[PDB]
Each structure stands twice: as C-alpha cells, then as structure tokens.
Design a protein around this ligand. Structure first.
Ligand SMILES: O[C@H]1CCCC[C@H]1Nc1ncnc2[nH]ccc12
Length: 167
C-alpha cells in the first residue's frame, strides 16, 4: 500500500492521473520523482522548469555542479540527484527531443531507467515541449517499465485522450 490517490489503473504496474506533478510531488513526497531533463540539466521550461521553480532554483544549482563534474548525460540516460522539497530523490531522465531531431527509438532506453526504482512519480517522457506523441510515449512506458509508475498528466484534455485511446 502506498500514498498515491485518485489514479486510474492502466495495467498491473502503470497508473495515470490528471495532476500537476509539482503539486502531486508536494503532497505525496514520493521516494522518486522523475524529471523530464535534457542532457545539460538546464531546467528552463516544461516539467523541468516547473520542478526547478518549485525548489527555488536549488535543483538547478545542484545540477550545474553535477554537470561541471561529470559532463552531459546521454539521450536515453539518467542520473539520480536530490528531490529537494519535492521527493527524496529526483531521477533526471533524458527522453529524445523531436524538436532537436533525436531518434524516437531512444524513448524505450529512457523508460528503462525507471526499472531501477521500485516506485516512481513521473511525467510522460518526451511529451510536451519534447515534441513526441504522448499516446506513443504512454505505449512505450507500459511496454517497458516493470516497476510501479504513477504518471501525472498536466493537461486534462490530453489525459482524457490518453485514457480513451488506451489499448
Ligand atoms: O502537459 C504535458 C506537456 C508536457 C508533457 C507532459 C505534460 N507536462 C506536465 N505533466 C505533469 N506535470 C506538469 N507540470 C508542468 C508541466 C507538467
């Protein structure tokens, strides 16, 4: 039993809700919140800009030190950093950005990072400003993640569409 509330169950291990991931993180304090990161951990907009803003820029300060030490992530890769005031940990995961021409097949590799964590609160990778089809992203999530994932979808309209079209 966990503290996530109001989610629709899609499969044995995947759950979905119309929610603001920032507000959901603030209320649940999950062990892991997933950030929709880029390789530079520059949290300027989308989910990343919102999460970072909610940490009063502490996420960005920590991220800049991480990059200065380790260099950029790989597309499809991830790193674990602090969850600050939102979660114990933040798993920064880089899905391919279609608006940068990155290969969509890397979306499966991106979701594989979730399997290293038993339970996660997450957005749909490569959705939103990353330019992928959120319905495809949901399908890859369901077919790749085996651990328990609670997906927060900010837009009520997209949420209804994802549910109504789910196979
Ligand atoms: O609405 C879409 C657009 C981008 C792809 C995923 C969704 N973004 C979010 N999802 C969950 N919480 C969020 N807080 C701010 C944005 C956000």
């Amino acid at each position: 039993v966990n503290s996530f509330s109001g989610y629709l169950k899609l499969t044995d291990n995947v759950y979905i809700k119309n929610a603001d991931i920032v507000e959901e993180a603030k209320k649940v304090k999950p062990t892991v919140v997933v950030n929709a990161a880029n390789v530079y951990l520059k949290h300027g907009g989308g989910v990343a800009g919102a999460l970072n803003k909610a940490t009063n820029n502490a996420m960005q300060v920590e991220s800049d030190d991480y990059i200065a030490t380790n260099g950029p992530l790989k597309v499809g890769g991830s790193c674990v950093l602090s969850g600050h005031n939102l979660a114990k940990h933040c798993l920064h995961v880089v899905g391919p950005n279609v608006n940068k021409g990155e290969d969509i097949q890397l979306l499966k590799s991106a979701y594989e990072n979730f399997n290293q964590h038993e339970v996660l609160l997450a957005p749909l990778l490569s959705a939103g400003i990353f330019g992928a089809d959120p319905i495809h992203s949901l399908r890859v999530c369901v077919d790749t993640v085996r651990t328990n994932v609670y997906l927060a979808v900010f837009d009520k309209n997209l949420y209804d569409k994802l549910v109504s079209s789910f196979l």
